[PDB]
Amino acid sequence: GLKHPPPMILIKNTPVPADPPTTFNPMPQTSFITEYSTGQVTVEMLWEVQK
Amino acid sequence: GDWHCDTKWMGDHVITKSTRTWVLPTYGNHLYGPINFDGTTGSGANAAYAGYKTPWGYFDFNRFHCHFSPRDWQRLINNHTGIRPKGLKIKVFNVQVKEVTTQDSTKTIANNLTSTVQIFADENYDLPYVLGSATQGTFPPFPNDVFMLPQYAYCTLQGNSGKFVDRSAFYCLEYFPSQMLRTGNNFEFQFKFEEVPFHSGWAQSQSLDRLMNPLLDQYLIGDYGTDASGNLIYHRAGPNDLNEFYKNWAPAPYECIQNINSSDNTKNANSINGSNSTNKWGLQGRQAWDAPGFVQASTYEGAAAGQSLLNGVLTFDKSSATTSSPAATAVNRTIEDEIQGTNNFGNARNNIVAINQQTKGTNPTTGSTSQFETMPGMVWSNRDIYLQGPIWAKIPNTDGHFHPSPRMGGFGLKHPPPMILIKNTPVPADPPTTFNPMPQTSFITEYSTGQVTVEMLWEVQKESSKRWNPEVQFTSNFGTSDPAVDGIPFGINNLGTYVESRPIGTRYISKHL
Amino acid sequence: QNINSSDNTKNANSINGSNSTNKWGLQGRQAWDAPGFVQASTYEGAAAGQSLLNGVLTFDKSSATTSSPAATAVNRTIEDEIQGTNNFGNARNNIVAINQQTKGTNPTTGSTSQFETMPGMVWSNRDIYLQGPIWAKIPNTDGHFHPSPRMGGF
Amino acid sequence: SLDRLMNPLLDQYLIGDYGTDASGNLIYHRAGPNDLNEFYKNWAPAPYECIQNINSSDNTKNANSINGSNSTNKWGLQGRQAWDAPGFVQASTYEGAAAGQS
Amino acid sequence: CTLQGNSGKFVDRSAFYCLEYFPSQMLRTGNNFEFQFKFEEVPFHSGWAQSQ
Amino acid sequence: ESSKRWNPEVQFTSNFGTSDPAVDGIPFGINNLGTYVESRPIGTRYISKHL
Amino acid sequence: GDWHCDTKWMGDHVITKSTRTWVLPTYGNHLYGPINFDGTTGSGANAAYAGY
Amino acid sequence: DSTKTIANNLTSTVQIFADENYDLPYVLGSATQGTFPPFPNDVFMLPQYAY
Amino acid sequence: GDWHCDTKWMGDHVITKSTRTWVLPTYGNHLYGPINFDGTTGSGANAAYAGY
Structure with a gap:
């Protein structure tokens, strides 16, 4: 039990918009390029033990 | 080049940061063009x-919800009686240029690392300044939305039927120095605001005719009338008549504006033509609406529910929309009653003046007036600022101006934040193998996108009031919301759209006059 | 409106003062505008006793509680020293053009009861008196025009 | 000009009051490129006292036998009147007006 | 007087002040109270009559 | 209070329609008889936090 | 940026390292959304x- | 049509932050799925955040 | 010896002051006394x- 546990690490792909129309529109743009990401993660922990 | 979007409250000042994602199309096929309207197919000659x-485009951050979340805005208005802008800095970064190819039905989008974009700030105010007209294209209030940059255009001096004249000006934007950005390059700009007064963030807890000690009498004697023989009669004002006290100060000037009731249709007349009933000012032989006008009280305590003024208040959309005729359930209509102490109701038209010269045989007569303008000894309050409203406006460059506070709201500035303009650099397609002198009209189809961060330094005034009883505060009050249909107010609904539930002013804490 | 303090032959009979005074509205009710922005109460050549109805300050000769003091018990001020820059209050003699003239329609003008501040005007403030107030507090507001208190002083 | 300061391609995010319907309900309208005169605006033009027109070039525009002193603007002081001239400056003519307008 | 509604009734923004909530000093016989004040800059009142 | 929620929070506010100075007076104030009245109870819990 | 995944036993303490490969899709079409359940089609009101 | 092509984009980004002040609802510690796999050679999805 | 009754908000701490007027009678005619209740005329033995 911990008052201050290891904090959450959050991640997301940055949205990349598709081609806009050539006339200005005030609405938010809903069309995006389909993508995903991948990588490596390493975690290192120091533990204390009793013999 | 990292994301920020956050607020830091330090004592007497506060810093806001926000980051958005923008997309820039090629406008106008890389061409300039003249535009007119003669008015016929539209409203008429007044249009x-x-x-x-x-071909260029530009950034507009000039609304408050660009810089403040609703919770931050609450933290401001309950605890502070004033705010003014101090400094500004802008960064454009992570630019990508993308090429579009269409073969048959399918459409492919590829990245081009060497192609550029051009950007410059207009620091000397050389271009016509189109900010401060409260048009669309501002940064979205919700930080995750992607938005288009609007195309830049301007009006110049006209003659009859929307024709150019000798003083009409054409501007070439390539005649300015600008810097060219590839992937990996960024643009930065810093700005310092001129000194302005704090916006007044409180509601009035007194009225201008009640400033006296109610228990006492004046040592000044008033004129009560004449007797049957014509001798002047004197009267001393006191607690039984407070309206007859001699006073040092007078309320705000007005142009009479027509009333309207937004809630209750039994109060309104049928089939009102709004354009025929609004206040107007003329210029160059044509007329334009005067709206919202110089601010008046839209309602006062004791007035009927829903009382308002026709084109006398600001009205906002709940969500970004293109609709030309939005429904009443889709809008946020502001109410200014916090100024009712110094500012009369807009449709009252109840000031009285003497219309003749009395002698024995002719009785004195008076009349009410629809027009009462500025006189020595008047006091008034400015229109409120809103979370959905504009921050600043550019004071016109002229010999004279009277109390240059912009009528829609905010801070009048001799030197506002300059316009930042941007466009994709044209990339020609394959030329012919024989020389041709003509300009080349064939280009590669492309668009660009990136991130922009804006950081503002604000100065604020903390609230010292010594009243004993508690004060009104802005609070979140709604019975229940359906997550299936609706969602949390000031939040994302079931369709993924951000909704601003109600309008929010700055005037909650109260002060005596 | 004008009033004559000395000579009753100049006044109309049975004037109701409250109905004839200038008023401004606020919050759905009305209050007297008095003394108002100062005007000349009389000028040289005007009849003796010429004054303005609730346009001047009037004081008691001695401290008193009376609600309706007699004329012999009061000191009525006269401001004629401003008659160079400030018109007589009941004159209403400024003239403006009320139509647009063409061949066939003659130009017409009219007098006005209201003429407000324009670029290029000059004026004088109301005088201070040995019996009058010294100072007043300017209301705390976004805007005010020429904040000189109307009854007098600083 | 002071009514054209906007970007002519865009619409406002402010909504105007268009009128009432047959039952008396308020109707809303968004101003845009088809009506630029209905835009909400921050600034207003100059104050005026109305001054009579005259045409210096073309006598067919003027009325006959105008008495100038009777038709000019005047202010009173000390029980007498004086001309207010030239007055606070107004535009004497504008583009599209007839030739000689003053 | 404070902000009113119809018929001289209080409303939400009406303010009540307790004067005992201020610091004050207590005077017996032999004690005195002193206060000093400086006026802000204002123009001279014009003490002349116009001869033109 | 440091909270990072986006939407606004509940605050304690003075809400009453109208009060009669003849009969009643201002809430949390002196009534017509000179008596001090505490109109409603007030806790400390208004701002919200997740667990 | 290299791989590790290993353990080192030192006396009264021990250090673990591990390396993995992750994949992140786009969730929700870049949208937030509210979610509820009233319980009926599931267990019931307790759900x-x-x-x- | 039927086929699916996958290309690499060198300029596009991903966003990551740790929540050090515990400002978000903490959904770890509920013993749900989406943890690192025990066997080091497996590839795993990151779960979607919700509260 | 002066009046105060006031509050000062400083950052992470706040100071309150208040002043009142008290009146003290002579109690019990300058006497101590024992007091009991056996409960009967009241609630009962629990009292x-x-x-x-």
Whole structure:
């Protein structure tokens, strides 16, 4: 039990918009390029033990 | 080049940061063009204009919800009686240029690392300044939305039927120095605001005719009338008549504006034509609406529910929309009653003046007036600022101006934040193998996108009031919301759309006059 | 409106003062505008006793509680020293053009009861008196025009 | 000009009051490129006292036998009147007006 | 007087002040109270009559 | 209070329609008889936090 | 940026390292949304929730 | 049509932050799925955040 | 010896001051006395007490 546990690490792909129309529109743009990401993660922990 | 979007409250000042994602199309096929309207197919001769549209585009951050979340805005208005802008800095970064190819049905999008974009700030105010007109294209209030940059265009001096004249000006934007950005390059700009007064963030807890000690009498004697023989009669004002006290100060000037009731249709007349009933000012032989006008009280305590003024208040959309005739359930209509102490109701028209010269045989007569303008000894309050409203406006460059506080709201500035303009650099397609002198009209189809961060330094005034009883605060009050249909107010609904539930002013804490 | 303090032959009979005074509205009710922005109460050549109805300050000769003091018990001020820059209050003699003239329609003008501040005007403030107030507090507001208190002083 | 300061391609995010319907309900309208005169605006033009027109070039525009002193603007002081001239400056003519307008 | 509604009734923004909530000093016989004040800059009142 | 929620929070506010100075007076104030009245109870819990 | 995944036993303490490969899709079409359950089609009223 | 092509984009980004002040609802510690796999050679999805 | 009754908000701490006027009678005719209750005329045996 911990008052201050290891904090959450959050991640997301940055949205990349598709081609806009050539006339200005005030609405938010809903069309995006389909993508995903991948990588490596390493975690290192120091533990204390009793013999 | 990292994301920020956050607020830091330090004592007497506060810093806001926000980051958005923008997308820039090629406008106008890389062409300038003249634009006019002669008015006929539209409203009429009052609608005519002449000008130019350009291939360029620009950034507009001039609304408050660009810089403040609703919770931060609450933290401001309950605890502070004033705010003014101090400094500004802007960064454009992570630019990508993308090429579009269409073969048959399918459409492919590829990245081009060497192609550029051009950007410059207009620091000397050389271009016509189109910010401060409260138009669309501002940064979205919700930080995750992607938005288009609007195309830059301007109006110039016109003659009859929207034709150019000798003093009409054409501007070439390539005649300015600008810097060219590839992937990996960024643009930065810093700005310092001129000194302005704090916006007044409180509601009035007194009225201008009650400033006296109610228990006492005046040592000044008033004129009560004449007797049957014509001798002057004197009267001393006191607690039984407070309206007859001699006073040092007078309320705000007005142009009479027509009333309207937004809630209750039994109060309104049928089939009102709004354009025929609004206040107007003339210029160059044509007329324009005067709206919202110089601010008046839209309602006062004791007035009927829903009382308002026709084109006398600001009205906002709940969500970004293109609709030309939005429904009443889709809008946020502001109410200014916090100024009712110094500012009369807009439709009252109840000031009285003497209309003749009395002698024995002719009785004195008076009349009410629809027009009462500025006189020595008047005091008034400015229109409120809103979370959905504009921050600043550019004071016109002229010999004279009276109390240059912009009528829609905010801070009048001699030197506002300059316009930042941007466009994709044209990339020609394959030329012919024989020399041709003509300009080349064939280009590669492309668009660009990136991130922009804006950081503002604000100065604020903390609230010292010594009243004993508690004060009104802005609070979140709604019975229940359906997550299936609706969602949390000031939040994302079931369709993924951000909704601003109600309008929010700055005037909650109260002060005596 | 004008009033004559000395000579009753100049006044109309049975004037109701409250009905004839200038008023401004606020919050759905009305209050007297008095003394108002100062005007000349009389000028040289005007009849003796010429004054303005609730346009001047009037004081008691001695401290008193009376609600309706007699004329012999009061000191009525006269401001004629401003008659160079400030018109007589009941004159209403400024003239403006009320139509647009063409061949066939003659130009017409009219007098006005209201003429407000324009670029290029000059004026004088109301005088201070040995019996009058010294100072007043300017209301705390976004805007005010020429904040000189109307009854007098600083 | 002071009514054209906007970007002519865009619409406002402010909504105007268009009128009432047959039952008396308020109707809303968004101003845009088809009506630029209905835009909400920050600034207003100059104050005026109305001054009579005259045409210096073309006598067919003027009325006959105008008495100038009777038709000019005047202010009173000390029980007498004086001309207010030239007055606070107004535009004497504008583009599209007839030739000689003053 | 404070902000009113119809018929001289209080409303939400009406303010009540307790004067005992201020610091004050207590005077017996032999004690005195002193206060000093400086006026802000204002123009001279014009003490002349116009001869033109 | 440091909270990072987006939407606004509940605050304690003075809400009453109208009060009669003849009969009643201002809430949390002196009534017509000179008596001090505490109109409603007030806790400390208004701002919200997740667990 | 290299791989590790290994353990080192030192006396009274021990250090673990591990390396993995992750994949991240785009969730929700770049949208937030409210989610509820009223319980009926599931267990019942004890199963209801609201969130984002 | 039927086929699916996958290309690499060198300029596009991903966003990551740790929540050090515990400002978000903490959904770890509920013993749900989406943890690192025990066997080091497996590839795993990151779960979607909700509260 | 002066009046105060006021509050000062400083950052992470706050100071309150208040002043009141008290009146003290002579109690008990300058006497101590024992007090009891056996409970009968009141609630009952659960109400009994002894003291001074």
